[PDB]
């Protein structure tokens, strides 16, 4: 037993970092979305100030607008960029939790067929005894 | 492997004596409905300020 | 609820569930070892031979 | 307005789950007579099996 | 263990049984997305089964 007692109790506290890890995850995800989102109301905010600008007869500052925008917009696809690629880890760390969970069941069903076989090695030291 | 060898024993030495000394039945239950007990009071205080 | 290290309640369930049951488990594996003997057979066609010689004196005894 | 109705549908979540956690508390009282019943019985038997 | 495992496995009958109604109850009511996934169960539980 001692070898799988030690073993099932480290095994099942791994799993409660990597579902930590995994939250920290969505929280990029979120995180970023939200960031993203911003950028597009800030472009949106841009584009009217910039168009109110134009109507007021002030092209000069509707022009420093634009430059916010197309900043902004790179800024946006950066942040696109990330957003894609953070994602592939969200998947790939669920994929080793599911795993996870059907081995630390198999380990637990180990140890009783492993007192089955130690309980016969020791029956017949036991027989040998006579 | 010498090393985690080590770890090995040190941490079975210690939880042998850990699972030998604290494991119960009639200890587990008592304590176990007196914590859960108390928490519903901490989450309900929480609450009650959330929902105000 | 999703469990932590120490949660109150599935902590005291990992050992009070398993323990409990493996107790109960054990005096039928070795109730069964104890009950395997064939004198203990014997004895269970005994009571129903006894059942039956007696009613035998107990229905003659009564007849009169 | 915005926060308000965010933090409100945050706050139903969590009367609704003090719902659920009074009824597991509840099936937890109900365990221990059974429970201990199972193990007097069992701790009867280590006894009289092993004389 | 023999008798451990035994109410294991039919422990895992009865919960492949379970999701079975679960997984036919909800398509009665519509919900083919939930079903396809309380299958998914089924096999889950039937490899543990095997394996048992």
Do not use: C, H
């Not at chain 1, 109507?55 to 902004?72: H, I, P, S």
């Not at chain 1, 016969?120 to 030291?125: L, R, V």
């Amino acid at each position: 037993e001692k070898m799988l007692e030690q073993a099932i109790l480290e095994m099942q506290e791994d799993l409660v970092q990597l579902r930590q890890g995994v939250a920290q995850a969505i929280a990029a995800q979120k995180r970023s979305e939200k960031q993203y989102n911003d950028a597009q109301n800030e472009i949106n905010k841009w584009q009217r100030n910039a168009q109110l600008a134009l109507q007021k007869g002030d092209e000069n500052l509707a022009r420093q607008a634009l430059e916010r925008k197309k900043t902004y917009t790179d800024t946006s696809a950066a942040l696109k960029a990330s957003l894609d690629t953070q994602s592939t880890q969200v998947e790939t760390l669920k994929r080793n939790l599911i795993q996870l969970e059907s081995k630390i069941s198999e380990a637990k069903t180990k140890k009783e067929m492993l007192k089955a076989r130690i309980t016969t090695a020791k029956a017949q030291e036991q027989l040998q005894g006579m | 492997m010498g090393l985690f060898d080590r770890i090995k024993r040190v941490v079975s030495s210690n939880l042998n004596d850990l699972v030998n000394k604290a494991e119960d039945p009639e200890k587990m239950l008592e304590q176990a409905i007196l914590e859960m007990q108390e928490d519903l009071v901490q989450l309900r205080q929480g609450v009650a300020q959330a929902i105000a | 609820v999703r469990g932590m290290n120490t949660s109150s309640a599935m902590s005291a369930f990992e050992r009070m569930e398993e323990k409990v049951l493996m107790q109960e488990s054990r005096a039928q594996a070795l109730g069964e070892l104890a009950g395997a003997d064939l004198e203990t057979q014997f004895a269970q066609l005994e009571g129903g031979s006894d059942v039956d010689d007696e009613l035998a004196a107990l229905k003659a005894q009564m007849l009169p």
